[PDB]
Amino acid sequence: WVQLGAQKVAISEFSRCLELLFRATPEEKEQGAAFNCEQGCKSDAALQQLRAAALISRGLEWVASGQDTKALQDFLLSVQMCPGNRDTYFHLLQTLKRLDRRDEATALWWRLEAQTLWSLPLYLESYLSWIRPSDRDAFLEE
Amino acid sequence: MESLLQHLDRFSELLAVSSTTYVSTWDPATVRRALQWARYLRHIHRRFGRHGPIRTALERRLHNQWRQEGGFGRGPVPGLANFQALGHCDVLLSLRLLENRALGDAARYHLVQQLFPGPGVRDADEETLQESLARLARRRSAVHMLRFNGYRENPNLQEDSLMKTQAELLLERLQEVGKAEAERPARFLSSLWERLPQNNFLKVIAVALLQPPLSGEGSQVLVHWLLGNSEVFAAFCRALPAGLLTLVTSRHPALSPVYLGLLTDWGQRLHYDLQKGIWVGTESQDVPWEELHNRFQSLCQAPPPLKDKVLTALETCKAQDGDFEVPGLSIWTDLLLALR
Ligand SMILES: [Zn+2]
Numbered sequence: 001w002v003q004l005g006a007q008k009v010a011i012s013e014f015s016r017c018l019e020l021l022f023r024a025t026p027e028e029k030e031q032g033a034a035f036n037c038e039q040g041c042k043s044d045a046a047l048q049q050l051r052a053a054a055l056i057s058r059g060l061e062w063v064a065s066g067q068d069t070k071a072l073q074d075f076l077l078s079v080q081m082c083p084g085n086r087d088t089y090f091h092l093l094q095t096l097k098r099l100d101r102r103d104e105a106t107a108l109w110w111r112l113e114a115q116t117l118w119s120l121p122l123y124l125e126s127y128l129s130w131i132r133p134s135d136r137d138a139f140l141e142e
Numbered sequence: 143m144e145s146l147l148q149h150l151d152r153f154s155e156l157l158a159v160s161s162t163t164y165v166s167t168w169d170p171a172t173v174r175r176a177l178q179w180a181r182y183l184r185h186i187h188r189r190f191g192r193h194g195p196i197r198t199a200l201e202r203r204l205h206n207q208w209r210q211e212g213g214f215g216r217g218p219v220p221g222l223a224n225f226q227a228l229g230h231c232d233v234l235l236s237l238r239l240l241e242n243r244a245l246g247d248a249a250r251y252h253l254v255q256q257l258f259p260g261p262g263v264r265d266a267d268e269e270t271l272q273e274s275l276a277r278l279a280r281r282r283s284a285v286h287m288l289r290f291n292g293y294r295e296n297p298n299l300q301e302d303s304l305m306k307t308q309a310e311l312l313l314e315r316l317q318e319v320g321k322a323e324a325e326r327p328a329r330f331l332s333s334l335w336e337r338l339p340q341n342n343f344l345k346v347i348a349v350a351l352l353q354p355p356l357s358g359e360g361s362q363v364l365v366h367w368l369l370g371n372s373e374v375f376a377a378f379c380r381a382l383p384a385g386l387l388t389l390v391t392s393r394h395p396a397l398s399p400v401y402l403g404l405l406t407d408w409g410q411r412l413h414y415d416l417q418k419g420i421w422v423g424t425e426s427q428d429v430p431w432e433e434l435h436n437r438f439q440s441l442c443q444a445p446p447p448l449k450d451k452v453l454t455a456l457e458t459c460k461a462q463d464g465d466f467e468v469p470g471l472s473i474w475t476d477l478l479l480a481l482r
Contacts (some may be wrong), residue, residue, distance in 0.1 A: 007237075011466070011471070012466065012467075012468060013469060015466075015468050015469075015470040016468055018416055018470065019468070019469070019470065022416050022417065022419070023419050073413075078414065127160070
């Protein structure tokens, strides 16, 4: 729907993706009830990297409808979710550099420099690779 | 009519000093004179109390006395309350004299000997003073017993027994000031608000509004006082249960669209958090989700005159904040999902 350009029904499906991450758990092998995804669809890494992504995909719709407080809240959540994606910090810092840079931005700079792939599946890494912006480290050395 | 004024104001002076602790000068003469005057008031009350210009004239003198004293700054004297308090004025005075500790021994002796000779006058024509203090001590005890072995703090406060009572006292007291026309009832209600325990007070009013008429000029005064002052009405809608305010609405629809306005203002002070499946307040004093769900559930569980109003007031509020049809987004989506 974002490629067909329709903010509403995008922010629908991102929000419904975030409800079936958070009012449900995928790690319920109390009943091995069938044949089931060993590897791809149970990794804590695959879960925190679906979450960061959904909040990014939705926080940029919030920038496009012009509600940049909502956007900030979902971006701030995604850094709380997955501190080793860096796309999250880029989107959050772009929002802060627009509005209220100085102390907030620097506080996250020092965190990135404090910080410094395991088994995420393909469809998902290719999706992350897809959205990520080229001009990312360029922004992080400013 | 004119003869009664100098009698009654002199008795009122003597009543107000009954409470007061100067009692050294008093003697059997003073006591006897007091109770003779009190007999005459009780006499008047019987003779030409009913359906007279005299009654209404004494009520003007009552309320004029009771507003020029006011009950602010100098001395908050209760006084002889109203027209039926003339029928047992004697008792009030005698009770106040017992409560004065500095009441002189000889006066108290003459007093108690005159109130309670004993059973020598078990034959008395007029339902006498002795019998009045007995049937009081009885009622009193009866109350106390019934409170501690019988009394229940009803959950439909519109059917409570103390509330129902305190309510009807305030309504009498507004009816009097209404016919006096001295100061506006607004001033009286404002002085209430200032002075007394507020929490208790408000439940009173709430019950007041649903009491059927007795002579609803009172009810029509309370709606206008409240709507005049939005700040107290904010704590009204805050401080009660849902059912009480639902019935306030179905009865007096001049309140409905201001209270819907309040919720409309409190919901819009919420945010979803994705970790915990809930709206919550920033600040401590902001209605939690469950409180607001209750109150709306109530407005809905109501007559059709209100139900369509509140349903449409939400749907228009939903469209205003994006007509999404999933939660996370619009508080009002949430409510409307929750109510099916
Ligand atoms: Zn799988």
